Amino acid sequence: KKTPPVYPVTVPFLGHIVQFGKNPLEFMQRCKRDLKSGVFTISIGGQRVTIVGDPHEHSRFFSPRNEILSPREVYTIMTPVFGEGVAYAAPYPRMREQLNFLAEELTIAKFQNFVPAIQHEVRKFMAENWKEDEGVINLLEDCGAMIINTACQCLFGEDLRKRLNARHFAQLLSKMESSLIPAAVFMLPQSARCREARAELQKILGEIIVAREKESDLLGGLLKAVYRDGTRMSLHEVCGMIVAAMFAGQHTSTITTSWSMLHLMHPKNKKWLDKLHKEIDEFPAQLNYDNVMDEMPFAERCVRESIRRDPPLLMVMRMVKAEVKVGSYVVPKGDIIACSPLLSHHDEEAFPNPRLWDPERDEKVDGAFIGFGAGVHKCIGQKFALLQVKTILATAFREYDFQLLRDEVPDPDYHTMVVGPTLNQCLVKYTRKK
Ligand code: HEM
Ligand SMILES: CC(C)c1ccc(NC(=O)O[C@H](Cn2ccnc2)c2ccc(Cl)cc2)cc1
């Protein structure tokens, strides 16, 4: 009549903290089987963390509006990176405007100059960093830029990038994130050390609008935005949404792209690689949007299966404000309710052989895949990242072949906020192709 089962903890203060850390997948795979339930409640620090790990129930986590399931108090962490009154740090109704504000820029209105834009960008890095017909790549780090390069290129305006190069906008981002550290979702020089990089970027920004006025891109659209009460976003409000737009893209999509390339370059998986080829071969250098979008479905599957196997975002969380029932269990207001792409995508009814990479697999429980989340919190970056990644792939597997130094694919380093493949494992020997 109330609640789902709880897991053993040997010593309380710790809870499950290192048991999670070592391997969150193993740990969760264990708990689920051992607790004979897809829905179960673990504990961090005498804080209650009840996971939603049975796929059929995802509706229960992703469907309810923020009041009933509220994300803010979980993501409070980002407030300094995003700003104090933005995204979650903003109140929800006003936040919704921000999401649609952002959404009206990733609107497929502006996607028409993107493809030819990121493509050219992929080459510019390749011809300048991939120089020889014999190759070195730390693909994870090389995709890190190729991603942040093409994106800035796509969303940063000509007058914007000159001032703030792609190469070193990363530098600000990767000085903002360093603020964000482990073990904070359930519990300063850097507050400053990061505030500085944000106040920096911000003035770098407010100094561009003056040149904008006394005289269009993500920023362009963002300033032309007026709220419900006919307000316009303050300097530092807009500043954050750019940060947030770009933070969200950089790692996920880098990882997604790397994880992606890896499986395809692998000898294990090379009927796919040549199925990619039967797909992208008759396509020319001239990449138009119809090509990526209308005529790249197989390649899309790969990227999706990449994200399926190893979701870059292991957990997503709400603070249970009202109390919500899930299957036959009930989640008590005061609990943190979580839902995990990582665990869910390894349910075997949903995804048989879940560590196997099969682009041409389909979810056998409708809704299982939650890589881009679901319900009232569906990712708004999805079609864009999907378009970045697809085009990067096409361009690269275009004129090239790839080899992995290793006998099999890198291990998911679960030792970060946003999980991608291992760093020291991700080296790849490139050779040129015609
Ligand atoms: C490419 C890999 C990506 C993955 C796997 C991903 C995954 C997700 C997930 C799971 C959520 C919501 C889940 C939760 O709140 O717990 C989400 C939300 C969001 N994503 Fe993404 N995302 C990706 C790329 C992007 C990109 C490229 C953008 C922007 C260009 C973006 C912008 C957002 C935004 C704005 C939200 C807010 C949704 C909300 O909380 O209401 N994401 N993403
Ligand atoms: C500007 C406004 C609409 C806006 C509001 C919210 C977000 N949220 C957001 O980016 O979520 C990222 C994860 N993510 C990565 C890819 N897609 C999503 C995130 C990571 C870690 C924590 Cl703790 C919380 C959130 C983005 C823009």
DSSP 16-61: THHHHHH-HHHHHHHHHHHTT-SEEEEEETTEEEEEE--GGGHHHH
Q: Which two tokens stand for residue 40?
A: 């179960």
Q: Which atom of ligand 1 lies at the shortest distance from residue 388's CA?
A: 27
46: left (phi over 0), alpha (psi -120 to 50) or beta: left
At residue 143's C-alpha, the angle toward residues 139 and 148, to 5°, is: 160
Q: Which of 21, 55, 62 is nearest to 186 (CA)?
A: 21
Q: Are 419 and 413 in contact (CB under 8 A)?
A: yes
Distance CA(131)–CA(430), nearest Å, equals 10
Domain, as residue range, for 92: 1-434
Given resolution (angstroms): 2.7
**Experimental method, per PDB record:** X-ray
Mutation test residue for ligand 2: of 66, 77, 78, 237, the one with most atoms within 8 Å of CB:
78
Distance CA(74)–CA(88), nearest Å, equals 9
Ligand 2 centre from 287 Cα, in Å?
A: 30
Q: Which two tokens stand for residue 283?
A: 């396509």
DSSP state of 357: -
Q: Which atom of ligand 2 lies at the shortest distance from residue 75's CA?
A: 23
Which residue puts its alpha carbon closest to atom 3 of ligand 2?
Answer: 99
Domain CATH for 110:
1.10.630.10
- DSSP H helices in 269-323: 270-280, 289-294, 297-309
Residue 152 assigned to a binding site: no
DSSP state of 301: H
Q: Where are the beta strands (DSSP E) in 216-355?
A: 316-320, 324-326, 329-331, 336-339
Say how many domains are in the chain.
1
Distance CA(72)–CA(91), nearest Å, equals 9
Mutation test residue for ligand 1: of 51, 318, 379, the one with most atoms within 8 Å of CB:
379
Which residue puts its alpha carbon closest to atom 35 of ligand 1?
Answer: 380
